[PDB]
Design a protein around this motif. Structure first.
Motif, mmCIF file in Angstrom:
data_model
loop_
_atom_site.group_PDB
_atom_site.id
_atom_site.type_symbol
_atom_site.label_atom_id
_atom_site.label_comp_id
_atom_site.label_asym_id
_atom_site.label_seq_id
_atom_site.Cartn_x
_atom_site.Cartn_y
_atom_site.Cartn_z
ATOM 1 N N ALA A 30 -86.620 -53.926 -35.668
ATOM 2 C CA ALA A 30 -87.593 -54.367 -34.677
ATOM 3 C C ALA A 30 -88.114 -53.190 -33.858
ATOM 4 N N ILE A 31 -87.218 -52.553 -33.113
ATOM 5 C CA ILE A 31 -87.588 -51.412 -32.284
ATOM 6 C C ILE A 31 -87.820 -50.167 -33.134
ATOM 7 N N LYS A 32 -87.106 -50.079 -34.252
ATOM 8 C CA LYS A 32 -87.234 -48.942 -35.154
ATOM 9 C C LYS A 32 -88.654 -48.838 -35.700
ATOM 10 N N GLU A 33 -89.159 -49.944 -36.240
ATOM 11 C CA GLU A 33 -90.507 -49.974 -36.797
ATOM 12 C C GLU A 33 -91.553 -50.006 -35.686
ATOM 13 N N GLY A 34 -91.088 -50.129 -34.446
ATOM 14 C CA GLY A 34 -91.995 -50.171 -33.314
ATOM 15 C C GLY A 34 -92.248 -48.799 -32.723
ATOM 16 N N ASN A 35 -91.186 -48.011 -32.584
ATOM 17 C CA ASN A 35 -91.299 -46.669 -32.026
ATOM 18 C C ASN A 35 -91.810 -45.684 -33.074
ATOM 19 N N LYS A 36 -91.399 -45.891 -34.321
ATOM 20 C CA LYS A 36 -91.815 -45.024 -35.417
ATOM 21 C C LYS A 36 -93.241 -45.346 -35.853
ATOM 22 N N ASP A 37 -93.679 -46.569 -35.575
ATOM 23 C CA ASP A 37 -95.024 -47.001 -35.937
ATOM 24 C C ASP A 37 -96.074 -46.078 -35.325
ATOM 25 N N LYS A 38 -95.720 -45.444 -34.212
ATOM 26 C CA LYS A 38 -96.629 -44.534 -33.527
ATOM 27 C C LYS A 38 -96.579 -43.142 -34.151
ATOM 28 N N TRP A 39 -95.395 -42.744 -34.602
ATOM 29 C CA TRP A 39 -95.215 -41.436 -35.221
ATOM 30 C C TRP A 39 -96.238 -41.212 -36.329
#
Length: 35
Positions: A23-32
Motif C-alpha cells: 500500500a505505502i510501498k507502491e505509494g511512495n515509490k510511485d513518485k520515484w
C-alpha cells in the motif's frame, strides 16, 4: 451501529494492513518514477 466499539476489536490488525507490504510501498515509490 457503534463504531467506537468496533475499533477496540482489533486496531492493530487493520493498522498492519494499512501499510507495510505494498500500500505505502507502491505509494511512495510511485513518485520515484513520476510516471
Amino acid at each position: 451501529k457503534k463504531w467506537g466499539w468496533l475499533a477496540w476489536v482489533d486496531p492493530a490488525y487493520e493498522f498492519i494492513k494499512g501499510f507495510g507490504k505494498g500500500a505505502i510501498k507502491e505509494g511512495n515509490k510511485d513518485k520515484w518514477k513520476n510516471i
